[PDB]
Write a structure and sequence with these properties.
heterohexamer, A: 449 residues, Naphthalene 1,2-dioxygenase Alpha Subunit, Chain A, domain 1, 2 domains, nine-stranded antiparallel β-sheet, 22 strands, 31% helix, B: 170 residues, alpha+beta, Nuclear Transport Factor 2, Chain: A, seven-stranded mixed β-sheet, 3 helices, binds biphenyl, binds FE2/S2 (inorganic) cluster, binds fe (iii) ion, binds zinc ion, oxidoreductase, rieske oxygenase, non heme iron
Chain lengths: 449, 170, 446, 449, 170, 170
């Protein structure tokens, strides 16, 4: 047993084993929708960015017709990489080896000496670069390798309820700012994934240094004091397709010292958000998030950092750090949020620098044979979770909880066990049977007030 | 554009040598105080790989950067090493700088434009080792019997940083 | 086959193959007693040291009661390493991720927000750190993962006869002196293992510069000359459980230039050793040893270097170099032995620096496919050996021999073939059948 | 399929996959004759070099009787490497561990303390360093491991017709000039192999800056412009055992800026070469070659660079660059050719430095799973090829083609599929059936003039 | 073998520092005319691993060498990088030099024999990094005001070059 | 202690530059005579990874140490390289030092407290390469020729040595 959804525990082979990584690449990264980027990274027709779909290099390009297309960054001639630039504007991509010109959708448009050497016998339509399915959600561009997969709408599914709160907001929505901060971290891709999905428990201990100096609202978390009630101060969420996040109330501009533009933006837009998405989602709109979109995209709403974990084997990843910001926010406010986000969660971040060893140590400790045969515990908040009357999916009582952990590894187990999407789609009705307490929030809300 | 005299070059070399000792010994408060001015702009911009035919301008302070701090925000970074209970850094990582190719130029108004190469070697725990190479660009002015940097631009060589973090001063 | 005990030869796959290394980890380092340290490394109650048990990290801790417990250095929550310090004093070990504190025996004593977040719905008895069995022999602490294994004293077995000569001696015994010199050598763990078990043949050739420079009684070995009688100069030994060592007669303080404390200690304590263990073991007490304890510990009594080869895969190891010194010796003598041991066999040792390529080249030459299909030869002095009347186990004629080589790979082959200890325990009365000449020492002495 | 000979395409798994490399090492490097060196590298009795045969370290030695013997550079005692010197003169090789003396033929001749410690019981006859089967052709020394393999002349076969043009020529022949230039390149060994066998197509595109600067005859290739007639400018050949090369007419001393002695040597020797072999091979004698001998030797006759690609796994090689010069040429001309060859195709070569990425990027692009499951095209000039009534094997109309590419991977597929040399030799009469245009050159020659 | 004076040592140090800046900034044409003589011999011989008992003489210019160029052949190499359009170098590799142990000695005819240690750090694309340790032996003359090298022997440490190429000036 | 004058700092730099050349060329006997005092204490302590709350004293020359030699024991180490037939040194392995951050201070009685960073790059055989970074604390002493070190404390960065050995001076 790699993952135990009933007991809420996982084997240490998940971070270390190379054959498990082979199953992950086949039944997750070559199946589910992966984050390519945003339309702000490729705004004008012709603009493109090279990015990773796990270990596959891909060129996301903004098309001349208006659509967004992506394809594998590899020439059909000898396999050579077509484009090496991180970003730019190009109507056609030329390979550096022989000069095969590729189109904006990866179609082989032209080849040098076609009439002379090839004698026009080269079937260029069959020699197109392996195209990738591209779909957008509120500007955020995703990518998928499986034709039999569902839509990006359905893949997010009930998680769209939450995303709409911030990714639409008061009509403006949000966008990514580049260029990103690329850096290699010697750890498994799931350790930062599980961390950013619902690890409010480490915030007080690991980031006790930074939180104490900054002060404000989040200073009380430092040292893991038992006096402060975390159940009333926050909540946690998890969905059908492994998407989940923790939320801290009234801490949107938490870590920001220079937050005038960002704080005023929320106070001006909270009235519109209360009207659109109700007071239940306005509560989230004013709070600090710690989200991971399955499998390998994470972000912190409020702190406004946006990360994507590109796996490079079972023991290493390449962390791409963007800065997520509102569209309708001022250019000065966007620059302010960028500086504060990078100062906190950049390559030399005041917080991010603390997690460095926490990610690597968990992975490379499994180098020992007796160690990796052991197991991991994710049972924080077992019994105190279930379907909320208002909020969709499963909800936890506190942000310092492991409801998101369980939901992440449950969908992981489902994807790893299932041979195809047809087997996954069959369990749409009975996916949350592993969460036994059904009448939890009914009894809890009746006891309150 | 005029290169500084050999005697002035020694004092700038000696300033950076003292500055390196304070980084390695962990005397950041004492560095921030003497060898850093209150109008400092500590800047480490993010250079992305572009084609040579690309006509876009180089990254400005308004654009994304790893470091982009003033004295107050730079002071906040320093206090994490002192007042903070950072578990990664008990004990502190051993760092060692190798400054070379120091070339000062008279920038007028008693200000000096200095260019230099920096090779940072970092060691922590048992077998972990990471190496970084940077191209520093400074503006130093004479303040009392010494120097103080007020503009500082650090150009990283590697696009993808092969390290847990870049939390170290140069 | 991998090992041939009959003809005394081994395949080159033993130093290279991945699947063999996977079988080694499981059928050796996860079954045998591995050297953790000594009481001197953790003298007072509360003192601890982090160390390796192969590729597993473990925390050896002196309990408040006095006993010693060890457990895997990994938090039961997410698997993160609990303690990164080499040594120190601690009544509890806190994990750096979320703050899970563990006791001296590796039990989950307390966790932050257990009342609030967990609601006391956490079986902390079952979520303790993976404990390891810990037994000690004359101060020297060992560790074992397999619960079905025998005792440490029985695992040593007939080898105890020899160990008692030096690890007890006059009465005090010996103790390690840290901190150790850690260093990575790109080679298989067996190559140093076989070297220190009985490779006196390489000493005259490889360390011809060091021996000729230092001079003395060990200077004659340099160059490998046939005129000197090696049969009279020393002997070689090997036991049932893979342990073995060579000995040079009256060469204890051979490599030491400054040796007023170490030599005079032996001169004062030899009379006590002669009374207790007799003249047969007095011979060993004055001689320079050359030992390896199976699997992966080794030392040199005389030069007083103590090494443990922690494997990091089939083509890499981490060498921890402690300094083994006598307890009853004076503080000045202990420090003198430490400097001489490190100067000879340290990281920048005058001898150890010569062996660098000899370890690595033997392993990495098997990168080629045609090379690794070849075989190695350990047949120096086959037949010229057998059961000694006085000394237990099997003994060889000269220290320059491969009796310990044969005995090392023989038990190695047995451990690799046996699925459990019951299969190994079955062949206690038929382990030395590979050595044919039983009436060798009976005729030689007559 | 790993290689498709009908459609002329190969899978990208060949550059990347470890199991394919395991087969390559079993079925190609352990079978085919590998280039060890030349007589000139070890000219006199006692002379040796250390070189590789794949990942195996070997010691080639010039014997007392004049013959050449090779053996594995590894001691029979504990495996330790015997000789670390790149070259020298020695009547015996002593292992540095214990001192086991090995002869020139790799026989364990002497052991320290044999009578004393070993008691003369050590069977030294059976403990010889494993000998490699050595055979030579026109000075060039080869090495083989398989006992059932054919002779060196049979292995070359049809290709010797071409080799005799240059490796004998006027009578002098050719020789290698050491010491070589050793350097690691992060790529598969087949990418340089296919490049030097017949990639005239990349020469104009990749080396446009270098060729345009030098000028002369080869300056016209810069940019691969359609105006020029590539068919008349050269040809391309391939043979049974995968040996093949392209030719550029009257461009031998093309890249040589200082070509005084080299061109004068050709002008003096072209007459006797014409009378010996004929005007069809005189055309070749004056032309610029780009050859690869299967599996892993390659050279450029004219520019006079000689390379051997020693594989260090599927994703790395060690390039050994020699300089190939004629025996009868003057010492000053040899040194002039040496400098011009290294300046062009050395470690810091003006041309070879351009190809650095083209080799590595083609290999490491297959790090992604979706990428490496794709395919590579090699259909340039398919159909425009066949058996020549004068030249042996299969010939192509232009040197900018992929006849050699097809023929290289065709024999590669034959070796990887066949379980032994007996199964290979069965295809002697039906190897070139994959080239369907039988009546190509008969129609071409009769239609012309 | 007379060591140069401290005043002359700085001028040679400042010359190599200005020389390093030109390689890093990619100003090869100005280097080729301003800091190199027209009778230059740029040489980098191929040393091989021999036994100590071997008595064969060390590599000469007649033997094999990675570099063995005159002035025109150096100009052939420089103009490739400058006017040409190399795809491998679009964009362009980040390079950085770290000169050390600059010991100069006086020779005949106002010439200076200079020994120097060089560490070259090269970065390119996303995660590609290579290091080269090298020993430099030069003969410099005083082109007032001003130095110009006319002999340059580069000694590589590693036998097998762990890099795609060695196409960079020292 | 007060920092040394520019003229004195140059002589110490020139002394170390010469000292490095003697290590690289393999002139260990001439080094020991000229450049080393007869009461030398060559010391390289084995530093341990300890928690910040742990208040044990720093290692001392009678705790474990890699180097802990006097002049007579330094001769033993030098004579191994000369008269000895070490096989790992056929051929002799290449080493290259990069001394930086040299800062001298007047201790007293004609003695100089000198701190400096050292980066050792070692190469041997075909593809074997190892790097070492370490801090050096010296007490130099003036005499007829120039200087002679009588105390030398070398501080290794890495806990676990990623090399076959540390058999090299400084
Ligand atoms: C995961 C990642 C970051 C945080 C977080 C850090 C600081 C302030 C607020 C939340 C919580 C969970
Ligand atoms: C194996 C290892 C070391 C020695 C040895 C070396 C020097 C002095 C005494 C024994 C003998 C065999
Ligand atoms: C393959 C390799 C090299 C060349 C070539 C390069 C320059 C000049 C002449 C031929 C052609 C094909
Ligand atoms: S590899 Fe892209 S054109 Fe040949
Ligand atoms: S991992 Fe050790 S506390 Fe959670
Ligand atoms: S290993 Fe070569 S002689 Fe023992
Ligand atoms: Fe965090
Ligand atoms: Fe030894
Ligand atoms: Fe080319
Ligand atoms: Zn200053
Ligand atoms: Zn500024
Ligand atoms: Zn970096
Ligand atoms: Zn100048
Ligand atoms: Zn010259
Ligand atoms: Zn190099
Ligand atoms: Zn001096
Ligand atoms: Zn001292
Ligand atoms: Zn080190």
């Amino acid at each position: 047993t790699l993952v135990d959804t009933v007991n809420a525990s996982q084997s240490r082979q998940v971070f270390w084993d190379e054959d498990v990584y082979a199953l992950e690449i086949e039944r997750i990264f070559s199946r589910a929708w992966l984050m390519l980027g945003h339309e702000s990274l490729v705004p004008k027709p012709g603009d493109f960015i090279t990015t990773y779909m796990a270990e596959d290099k891909v060129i996301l390009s903004h098309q001349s017709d208006g659509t967004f297309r992506a394809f594998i960054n590899s020439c059909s001639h000898r396999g050579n990489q077509i484009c090496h630039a991180d970003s730019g504007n190009a109507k056609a991509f030329v390979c550096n080896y022989h000069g095969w010109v590729f189109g904006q959708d990866g179609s082989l448009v032209d080849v040098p000496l076609e009439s002379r050497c090839y004698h026009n016998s080269l079937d260029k339509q069959k020699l197109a670069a392996k195209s990738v399915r591209v779909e957008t959600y509120k500007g955020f561009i995703f990518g998928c390798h499986d034709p039999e997969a569902p839509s990006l709408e359905d893949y997010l599914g009930e998680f769209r309820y939450y995303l709409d709160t911030i990714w639409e907001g008061a009509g403006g929505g949000m966008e990514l700012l580049g260029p990103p901060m690329k850096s290699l971290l010697q750890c498994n891709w799931k350790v930062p994934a599980e961390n950013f999905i619902g690890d409010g428990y480490h915030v007080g201990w690991t980031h006790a240094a930074a939180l104490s100096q900054i002060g404000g609202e989040l200073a009380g978390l430092a040292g893991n004091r038992a006096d402060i009630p975390f159940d009333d101060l926050g909540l946690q969420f998890t969905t059908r397709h492994g998407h989940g996040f923790g939320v801290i109330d009234n801490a949107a501009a938490g870590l920001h010292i220079k937050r005038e533009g960002w704080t005023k933006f929320l106070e001006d837009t909270r009235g519109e958000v209360r009207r659109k998405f109700g007071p239940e989602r306005e509560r989230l709109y004013l709070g600090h998030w710690n989200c991971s979109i399955f499998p390998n995209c994470s972000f912190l709403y409020g702190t406004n950092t946006f990360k994507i974990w590109h796996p490079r084997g079972p023991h290493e990843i390449e962390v791409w750090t963007y800065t997520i910001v509102p569209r309708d926010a001022d250019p000065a406010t966007k620059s302010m949020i960028q500086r504060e986000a990078i100062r906190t969660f950049g390559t030399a971040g005041t917080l991010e620098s603390d997690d460095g060893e926490n990610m690597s140590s968990a992975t490379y400790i499994n180098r020992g044979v007796i160690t990796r045969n052991g197991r991991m515990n994710s049972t924080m908040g077992v019994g105190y979770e279930g379907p909320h009357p208002v909020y969709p999916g499963i909800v936890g009582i506190s942000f310092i909880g492991e409801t998101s952990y369980r939901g992440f590894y449950r969908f992981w187990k489902e994807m790893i066990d299932a041979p195809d999407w047809a087997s996954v789609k069959a369990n749409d009705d009975t996916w949350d049977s592993v969460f036994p307490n059904r009448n939890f929030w009914n009894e809890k809300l009746n006891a309150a007030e | 554009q005029i290169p500084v005299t050999p005697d002035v070059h020694y004092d700038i070399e000696a300033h950076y040598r003292a500055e390196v000792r304070m980084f390695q010994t962990g005397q950041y408060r004492e560095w921030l105080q003497g060898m850093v001015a209150e109008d400092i702009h500590y800047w480490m911009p993010i250079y992305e790989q572009r084609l040579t035919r690309d006509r876009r301008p180089d990254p400005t302070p308004d654009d994304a950067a790893i470091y982009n701090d003033d004295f107050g925000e730079l002071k906040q970074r320093v206090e994490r090493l002192y007042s903070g209970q950072v578990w990664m850094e008990d004990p502190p990582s051993k760092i060692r700088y190798f400054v070379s190719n120091v070339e000062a130029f008279e920038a007028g108004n008693g200000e000096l434009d200095v260019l230099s190469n920096i090779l940072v070697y970092r060691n922590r725990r048992q077998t972990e080792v990471t190496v970084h190479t940077l191209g520093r660009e400074d503006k130093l002015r004479r303040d009392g019997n010494g120097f103080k940097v007020f503009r500082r631009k650090l150009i990283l060589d590697a696009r993808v940083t092969q390290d847990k973090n870049l939390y170290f001063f140069c």
